[PDB]
Design an enzyme around this catalytic site. Structure first.
Site, mmCIF file in Angstrom:
data_model
loop_
_atom_site.group_PDB
_atom_site.id
_atom_site.type_symbol
_atom_site.label_atom_id
_atom_site.label_comp_id
_atom_site.label_asym_id
_atom_site.label_seq_id
_atom_site.Cartn_x
_atom_site.Cartn_y
_atom_site.Cartn_z
ATOM 1 N N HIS A 1 0.822 -1.202 0.000
ATOM 2 C CA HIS A 1 0.000 0.000 0.000
ATOM 3 C C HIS A 1 0.863 1.264 0.000
ATOM 4 O O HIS A 1 0.379 2.361 0.270
ATOM 5 C CB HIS A 1 -1.000 -0.010 1.165
ATOM 6 N N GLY B 1 3.474 5.676 9.670
ATOM 7 C CA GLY B 1 4.765 5.255 9.159
ATOM 8 C C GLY B 1 5.508 4.338 10.128
ATOM 9 O O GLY B 1 6.736 4.299 10.125
ATOM 10 N N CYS C 1 4.165 1.518 9.459
ATOM 11 C CA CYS C 1 3.902 0.543 8.411
ATOM 12 C C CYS C 1 5.227 -0.062 7.943
ATOM 13 O O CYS C 1 6.177 0.665 7.644
ATOM 14 C CB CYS C 1 3.167 1.191 7.241
#
Lengths: 300, 300
Positions: free
Chosen positions: A41, A143, A145
């Site tokens: 993503h 972030g 992620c």
């Protein structure tokens, strides 16, 4: 002796943490050999993430999109493929400090260490469990992620989680390195909920068996009970029911403490029926379900 | 976002962990530059530890006593001096992976990361606090002696603890790298007790201020209160009283939440008076005092 919730050390995995960026989008990636894995993503902006077609968005991305940095230094991307929700970026370099590793898919119940990163720079680590409903009570800020969940058994690194997304609830979802999501979840911003959270019962039991060894043993009763009877009590209070394996696995504890697992169930059972009247086991006032019997044995 | 008790990463300090031995005695040491630090009580056996004279026991030890291993490899000791309770072994080699470091003495209240070792081989890590009574609720098994407590602020490694001994209570004591014991404790096996454990109040407050930001905010009242009035309540329940600094330090939280610190005290106060009626803040049923406002800010 002492008891504390405890992460493996993080030196190995710190070696493999990189920053990635794809335009305005900046998250964490993992560099193993000539490959870099990261959440797919990353090719999305906000406007995309609502209903993104990844097939169709990445058809429009080039290797010269993918800024990949190794701390001070930079890397050169040389081919981009997408496996489920993970993106596999080939690069020119193999990680000089890639150590003995393997990808595992964990099962709902197991625990692992988590390395929270921000721009490929690790910030912290904590021990964490894979919830019944395939979620995790984590610490994850924008972030994080691409921050990862691992274990270490005999030198080998056992990578088992990579984070994708928080949920409206505030618990976090993510995939394995296969790229398959733990749970019925996909990477988009639709009204996703997570099912009923229940308690990892076997684990609590190992946490009681712990408690005993650590001397703390107010909560012991005389009683025995059936497995079924125990279960027909437990499930009322949203707990995971208990199998002959569970008992088998709780076998080595029941040895060192001269306490039968049946007698431990009616003991636990009686905490559920009664409460705690505000006492503490291993200094906690809730029942601690984030310890597998392997965790607690290793801690001893 | 998420909240979890969280250790710094341990790669730097793993670089500096060595095994030491002195006859039958095998514990953990820390190799920084051309020096290796370790608990001095390594020169003792069991028969000694009752009343050991270190002056007089080490008068009888040679450099060829001190087996010091660097994982696979070995080192060569070349001079032995004893600073308080730490022993400083010079060796031929400087640590190739000695990174930016400094010794700090922490104050009772601060938290740090702990790297539990066994024969110089790190096993695990967890976040930990320096208790009022200069103790720590740890996980320490035989030959965790020489396992260390550190922090990381901007690359630099901030070594602040080295473990010596458990206590009859089951909490752990140890020194700084100066070698001075946190607390009135010395390394021998006399009936030592530790004073009254109380709660790091400022920290709980930062843990509430946390809770709020994380959305969880059932426990909020309207009330204000004085500092003194709050304190004349708190100290009844064995809590650390609260200073104008404490407030100052809790300043940046009180900003981001639009909640005054006075109004937070009467809120906490009311948990102490009332209880919790078995609810949970950030999923905990006890009040969590092992977070400094710096911990919680950094986590955000």
């Amino acid at each position: 002796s002492g008891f504390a919730k405890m992460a493996f050390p993080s030196g190995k995995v710190e070696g493999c943490m990189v920053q990635v960026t794809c335009g305005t989008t900046t998250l964490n990636g993992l560099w193993l050999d000539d490959v870099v894995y990261c959440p797919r993503h990353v090719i999305c902006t906000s406007e995309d993430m609502l209903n993104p077609n990844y097939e169709d968005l990445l058809i429009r991305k080039s290797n010269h999109n993918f800024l990949v940095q190794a701390g001070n230094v930079q890397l050169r991307v040389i081919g981009h493929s997408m496996q489920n929700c993970v993106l596999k970026l080939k690069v020119d370099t193999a990680n000089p400090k890639t150590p003995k590793y393997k990808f595992v898919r964990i099962q709902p119940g197991q625990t692992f260490s988590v390395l929270a990163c921000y721009n490929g720079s690790p910030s912290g680590v904590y021990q964490c469990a894979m919830r019944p409903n395939f979620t995790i009570k984590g610490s994850f800020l924008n972030g994080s992620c691409g921050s990862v969940g691992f274990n270490i058994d005999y030198d080998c690194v056992s990578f088992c989680y990579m984070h994708h997304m928080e949920l409206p609830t505030g618990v976090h979802a993510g995939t394995d390195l296969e790229g398959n999501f733990y749970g019925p979840f996909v990477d988009r911003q639709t009204a996703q909920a997570a099912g009923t959270d229940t308690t990892i019962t076997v684990n609590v039991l190992a946490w009681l068996y712990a408690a005993v060894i650590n001397g703390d043993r107010w909560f012991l009763n005389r009683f025995t009970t059936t497995l079924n009877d125990f279960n027909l009590v437990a499930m009322k209070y949203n707990y995971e029911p208990l199998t002959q394996d569970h008992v088998d696995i709780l076998g080595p504890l029941s040895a060192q403490t001269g306490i039968a697992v049946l007698d431990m169930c009616a003991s636990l059972k009686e905490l559920l029926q009664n409460g705690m009247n505000g006492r503490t086991i291993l200094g906690s006032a809730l029942l601690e379900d984030e310890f597998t019997p392997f965790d607690v044995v290793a801690q001893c």
